[PDB]
Nucleic acid binder design. Sequence first.
RNA 1: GCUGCGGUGUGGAAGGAGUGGCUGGGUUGCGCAGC
Length: 14
Amino acid sequence: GDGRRRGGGGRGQG
RNA sequence: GCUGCGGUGUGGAAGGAGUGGCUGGGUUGCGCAGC
Ligand SMILES: [K+]
Ligand SMILES: [K+]
Ligand SMILES: [K+]
């Protein structure tokens, strides 16, 4: 699961 | 691979989910949780 580590709104990019 | 919660702050105590984010911590860092 090496993708979006965290979610919600604009959380977790780069 | 995807998604939820201003829940976290060398401001987080007078705010949000980026209609401030090429103005910073931050190519949205950090923590927790779900598929
Ligand atoms: K801020
Ligand atoms: K912030
Ligand atoms: K933040």
